[PDB]
Amino acid sequence: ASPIGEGTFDDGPEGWVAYGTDGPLDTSTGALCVAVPAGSAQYGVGVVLNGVAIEEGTTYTLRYTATASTDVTVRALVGQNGAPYGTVLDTSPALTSEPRQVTETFTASATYPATPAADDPEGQIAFQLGGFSADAWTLCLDDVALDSEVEL
């Protein structure tokens, strides 16, 4: 129904938001580069993007290429915003001074409806940058696409 702009960020980060750092995030190039503070030592830094379309135990392919000036290894995945809650992804996005593309097929065992309401929650992506690298570093993605296996 409503993906996250199947593609990179060559014209706006769509809905990718980041918090716990300096000002908002900057793109103007085709990659979401956020300024992560030194070893993000504090409440914890992160980035959230609400607006996903998952349902029951369906298939899905997460595609994203992140690159942090440093070799930071934070955590990335997906889940539901509001009870009964339900996470489908559980991995750690490693980063380095080089481009790190990511492509995997996981079975979303939950439901992320694209309708933020008082009783009807939804689902999004979680990028936790709270306490991960040592000195100040950053994250630069540029190709986020999510879809269910509808080929057959």
Residue that is written with structure tokens 């540029």 in the block = 142
CATH number, domain containing residue 99: 2.60.120.260
Neighbours of 30 (CB within 10 A): 13
Sheet hosting strand 17-19, strand order edge to edge: 17-19, 45-50, 122-129, 75-81, 89-91
What is the 3-class SS of the chain, one letter each residue?
A: CCCCCCECECCCCCCCEEECCCCCCECCCECEEEEEEECCCCCCEEEEEECCCCCCEEEEEEEEEECCCCCCECEEEEEEECCCCCCCEEECCECCCCCEEEEEEEEEECCCCCCCCCCCCEEEEEEEECCCCCCEEEEEECCEECCCCCCC
Rg (CA), the chain: 15
Residue 19, both tokens: 């918090």
Residue entry with tokens 């029951």:
56
CB-based contact 71:95 (threshold 8 Å)? yes
Enumerate residues 6+ apart whose C-beta is below 8 A from 94: 71, 73, 100
- Cβ–Cβ contacts within 10 Å for residue 14, how many? 16
What was the experiment behind these coordinates? NMR
Contact (CB, 8 A) for 49 and 15: yes
| Distances, alpha carbon 55 to alpha carbons 2, 5, 18, 63, 73, in Å | 13, 19, 26, 18, 29
* Distance from C-alpha of 120 to C-alpha of 49, rounded to nearest angstrom: 17
Total tally of structural domains belonging to the chain: 1
**Which structural domain, as residue segments, surrounds residue 58?**
1-152
Sign of CA dihedral 76, 77, 78, 83: negative
Q: Which amino acid is at 133?
A: S
* C-beta separation of 109 from 88 below 8 A: yes
